[PDB]
């Protein structure tokens, strides 16, 4: 008997969706996990001013390796062995 207007999810007069208990428990546990993450992310170690350049050497070496791998692009080698053994298509009982 009760008819819903155009689309029960968008528009003005829409069918309202409510909350039960599973959603509340999920929100509670997610908020607890996020509060635990906030607590564990509330303590540094080097206090910023003690890391002006401790692992920059590894980054520079990795960048040099990536550059050497990207600048070493060349077509593969071409040998005569393939062109010679391709003649074995018409091989008989030899």
């Amino acid at each position: 008997r009760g008819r819903i207007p155009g689309r029960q999810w968008i528009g003005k007069h829409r069918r309202p969706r409510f909350v039960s208990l599973r959603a509340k428990q999920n929100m509670i546990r997610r908020l607890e996990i996020e509060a635990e993450n906030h607590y564990w992310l509330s303590m540094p170690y080097m206090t910023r001013e003690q890391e002006r350049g401790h692992a920059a050497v590894r980054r520079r070496e990795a960048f040099e390796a990536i550059k050497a791998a990207a600048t070493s692009k060349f077509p593969p080698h071409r040998f005569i062995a393939d062109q010679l053994d391709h003649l074995n298509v018409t091989k008989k009982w030899s």
Partner: peptide
């Protein structure tokens, strides 16, 4: 699309409704 202030109450979003229902007095 409707404005921010209207007279027909305007039902909020699903996530906003869940947040308001889980954070009650």
């Amino acid at each position: 699309g409707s404005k921010a202030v209207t007279r027909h109450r305007r039902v909020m979003h699903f996530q906003r409704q869940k947040l308001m229902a889980v954070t009650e007095y």
